[PDB]
UniProtKB/Swiss-Prot annotation, chains A, B, C, D:
It catalyses: alpha-D-xylose = alpha-D-xylulofuranose. It is found in: Cytoplasm. Mg(2+) 2 binds at E215, H218, D253, D255. This is Xylose isomerase. Transmembrane segments: none annotated. Its cofactor is Mg(2+). It is an enzyme of class 5 (isomerase).
Length: 385, 385, 385, 385
């Protein structure tokens, strides 16, 4: 189950680079030079890497220090053949963003947030990124009176419209993806789920430039079904990027390697992405646990890819199995894909078999056969067919 | 804190009428005649009542039995001055709906679901209802292979488009409101949150005819902030109706009386609805606990209204307090309501005070004063000012 | 992966017999005769069945009807070789138990609860049961003032002491197991977790007669790690029985078949039970989803056993793998099993290598190698070694 | 609602001293000198302060630096009249504790953990502390194979027994309190709830020296009822200390000021503590949100005390109200406090009114009147009587 760059696996600099600082503890690992992570990831079979501005260029860097950090990074990409398909802005770490970036109560902070983002969009484009992600991790509140949410959504819309105006005025081929999260580090975060982010996009001036970048662990922190949220995103044509990791239920954001956490959810996610033909990066936004040394870091990253490729094999075996195809008909998945009333409203109204002469008890007695189908899916996942 | 019909408080027949059957227990109360609930509610100060088809007319009723149930009900409304502002369909109780109504795998069931709904829209209109609610409580799955969610959302869209075609062809003045719930009775329910429902509406043929009917306990079962979800719904112009009750966290749907559960969330919800000038019904979808006899039923219903009116007083006192108005400026709520960049993109790009000469440390050091503001809100809620 | 009666798999009458009534829906299946479930389970390879009094003998049965229900049941057990290793009382379904059985506020109800339980202990003993389970599903509250919890725990202790007095006075070889659940059907249930139940047992007059009967889905409804709770129960010598099913996170009690829900938790549970040599019944307290007809019922039951036997194979393969044994040493699982200070307190106090000359940075730098170990566990679970 | 030192309000150095570093963000406030927090707290009306070793004496301090930090601190206590009723060890921050302190897999780390704790027990005693708290925040695991929980509980028991041996050999008047938490910073933490900690104490060599120190937000992170857990702790005679804060449901540990989060739970907690006559410190383990400057820090701390005193008034008014005393009898709270069968087992067995002639339907029909009682409690909390 060896990955190759064709599998389109990508990683954040901040993932394998996480030093292990948590709310209750100091760093357990030294900082990684981005050039070293690029080389180590390429050896593992990754396709590319992603970055926040502040991961690549230390906050406060002079223009000259900046050019030198970019130059070194670009040499590592050239040396390894690694791509940079996605970039993003850090609008959460510096104290200035303690009440948000785009929806900070302080107007000067909001204007600053926008300028910091625009600087990084120019960098992302230069590096070849196709998607620019926005995670508004500080947009939200711990208390009810601190944030009027209608006014905040006005400010959020204003920020994203200005960014769309900038990209279109520059003629850039880059699209935006909004990354929802329900809470942490704010007590509640605005646009908390895939659904909220999708609904919000429909009110922007140029909705076609924006999609979503959902994350496994994020939707699971609201106890939601991640494959169901991804199916809605695909149905809307808005899955621009996806972030893969593991999460054990509703608690703090664990960022476990992909495959860990809810293993059956990972299976159904892989089945969906592969059968819908999603062609974007498979990006891992995870943290090697702070229990690990560098060897455990690389083992953790390698495990992300391995688990995706194992699940891909099992899902493909499941859908290809004639016994499963027969079970899917037994469960009327074929009838779910047929229109309810392609004959139209009037014909439906006139159809006595739809109501007056519909035998509800006979219909009610038909079993759905879902448990046999689900055990076939279990047997395939476990290699017990 | 006495309600009057002007306060627009409404109740489901199925609320005070709940017999107390739960997953582990038999009914503890006899059935209520709908006419008796209408009279008892009117004495309490309610404005009106709502119904599922099957609450008013027993499933399977002949055409003549039907006319007689409607006649009696209409006489009680005339006798009391009670309105019927909202109605809905039961697409969840009968075994035929065990895999859904609009998104059942069986096509015949879906066609049946539509015809059952249309019959009840004609009734609702006759009774004067302005909103028709749809809660797809059986639309969903316990296992991954049982429901292809893209095909299900196609079927859901098809159902709602047909309903919009029917209403517009009949010239009815009625709008639809989708009621999201994340789980229960299905393991996961499609359109699980306010956000998912809003995003879905934007893909229907006539989005202007559809809004949301969120419920307190429903969003709280996903651990989400209910006032934040309602602010997004209002921002989108889609809050057509609202359902009020109480819920203690992420667990089964408790349907406690309004004010019970998360009391501070109830406060912030009332503050929002009143300050945004929401003019729709305040509907209570709750269950008097099965511990209660009929006297406890009416005490429970009366408590719903009482708690709304107490919270309304406290929220109004909060916003009117000059010391709070001063705290809100101290916290820059006024600056949140001002555009970030009404000067436009180019002026922002050229503004050195937004980046090159922005003093990030001085901005970072400004406290937000949110804790003093939140303690003023606590003191007002508790009458301790 | 074929079960045989030696695997000690057991099922509740009420499991395969569940008619599909939920809070929002009518039954989808006809009632099963207990004799038919005994025969169908035996054909599937089960070892035995369990029952509440009211599953076997309809509530209110005359003494003669009772003897006849027991006679028929006993003939089915004789015909099939099925055992009855556990029994329990229904103290939750009848309206009289709406505020509890042992901790009802009404003293007459509590006395009734005790007499109903004692009648069934005599039956259980006659049928050969070794464990008598108590699930206090109605012991709890929806509101704070309704139940003084200290007085309720006094009543709970009094009930269990009286039961221990009865069993010992009769010379019965039966032990009790308390089954904790955090909520549902009450808003909060007393003794909500394995830990609470264990702590409570230590205050009974004869603690040696009582243990716990934990359930997968129950602990997971509090977001707790089920294998960790079972390890504490085993550590205390109190795992008298166990109930196996599946649950997807914190929500209503789903009662999915075993292996469904959190699959990796099921793996770690099986690893623990098998390696600790638990010798009690593997009992399934699950519900075939109401989507299913009778064929789906039996497929669901068969899947419970199949998934246990697959997980047993994978866990045994994991622990037997020399590469895993080597990983476990790399992670110092061997050092965790050695006493910290068998040399004693004074020697520890005098040992300069434990503090004065302890090199904390060198210790801090050692990686734990947990991620390689966990990927070996994933590869074994998935058959990808 | 002005606190005075008689109200026994205490605060951790690390509470008002929290610099605002979170998983996603840098500090927003400068460090506080402990002497300054002592003075500022005393002006606010606090009774005392608590500390981890590392809050008072920077990790790695030489013996001389140590004596000087203690001297300064002791002068501030003398200058202000502040007490130190509780102390604790930091076994979570330094990287050496990344896999735990008492249950680290590495034996050398465990021995180190013990020696670090013992050094601080001598300090606590010198400073006059009556309770020594242990929060094993790093005792736990992110993956199943990393920690054998039976062996870990052996190591945990061994650590606590050695500490009890030390205290008794020194003749110290200090008792221990175990502080449970379900998760964070480990994926699952050992002894995750009040119940688990209570059950564990019963297996130590000298159980009388150990109790619990539960925290509001901790139990609520498992969705449990905090007042119910405290009632069980009181019932067992094990509530040695308590930590007060606020938490909005199941998510990361928010540490909001007391009264924030679940306000009705705070009310019922205060009612219990006051009516049970708990005489220990009311300690606040909270964090002023990182949005705040120093003025917001002190406002936040003051709000903790204010909210306790408001809730105390309302709970006392509730219990004193003749209309509530009458409601409590209507709901048979008086009958809950009477023994079920003080007449004994045989008399119960012979009592035909307990079964043979018990009218279950008449008993079933009695309403419990809980909703009227709960609305009286709401009216009292809100000052709307």
């Amino acid at each position: 189950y060896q990955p190759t760059p064709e599998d389109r696996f990508t990683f954040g600099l901040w993932t394998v680079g996480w030093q292990g600082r948590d709310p209750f503890g100091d760093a357990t690992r030294r900082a990684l030079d981005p050039v070293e992570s690029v080389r180590r990831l390429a050896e593992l079979g990754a396709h590319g890497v992603t970055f926040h501005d502040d991961d690549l260029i230390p906050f406060g860097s002079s223009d000259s220090e900046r050019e030198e950090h970019v130059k070194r990074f670009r040499q590592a990409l050239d040396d390894t053949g690694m791509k940079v398909p996605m970039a993003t802005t850090n609008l959460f770490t510096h104290p200035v963003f303690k009440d948000g970036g785009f929806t900070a109560n302080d107007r000067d902070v909001r204007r600053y947030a926008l300028r910091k983002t625009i600087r990084n969009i120019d960098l992302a484009v230069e590096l070849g990124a196709e998607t620019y992600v926005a995670w508004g991790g500080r947009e939200g509140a711990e208390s009810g009176g601190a944030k009027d949410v209608r006014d905040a959504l006005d400010r959020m819309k204003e920020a994203f419209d200005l960014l769309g105006e900038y990209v279109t005025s520059q003629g850039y081929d880059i699209r935006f993806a909004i990354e929802p999260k329900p809470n942490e580090p704010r007590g509640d975060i605005l646009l908390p789920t895939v659904g909220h982010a999708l609904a919000f996009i429909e009110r922007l001036e140029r909705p076609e430039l924006y999609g979503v970048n959902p994350e496994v662990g994020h939707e699971q922190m609201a106890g939601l079904n991640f494959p169901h949220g991804i199916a809605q995103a695909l149905w809307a044509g808005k899955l621009f990027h996806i972030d893969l990791n593991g999460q054990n239920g509703i608690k703090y954001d664990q960022d476990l390697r992909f495959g860990a956490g809810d293993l059956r959810a990972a299976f159904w996610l892989v089945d969906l992405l592969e059968s819908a033909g999603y062609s974007g990066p498979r990006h891992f936004d995870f943290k090697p646990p702070r229990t690990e040394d560098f060897d455990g870091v690389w083992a953790s990253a390698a495990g992300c890819m391995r688990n995706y490729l194992i699940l891909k094999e099992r899902a493909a075996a499941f859908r290809a199995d004639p016994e499963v195809q027969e079970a899917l008909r037994a469960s009327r998945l074929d009838e779910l894909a047929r229109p309810t009333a392609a004959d139209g409203l009037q014909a439906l109204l006139d159809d006595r078999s739809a109501f007056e002469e519909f035998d509800v008890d006979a219909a009610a007695a038909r079993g759905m056969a879902f448990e046999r189908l689900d055990q076939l899916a279990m047997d395939h996942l476990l290699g017990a067919r």
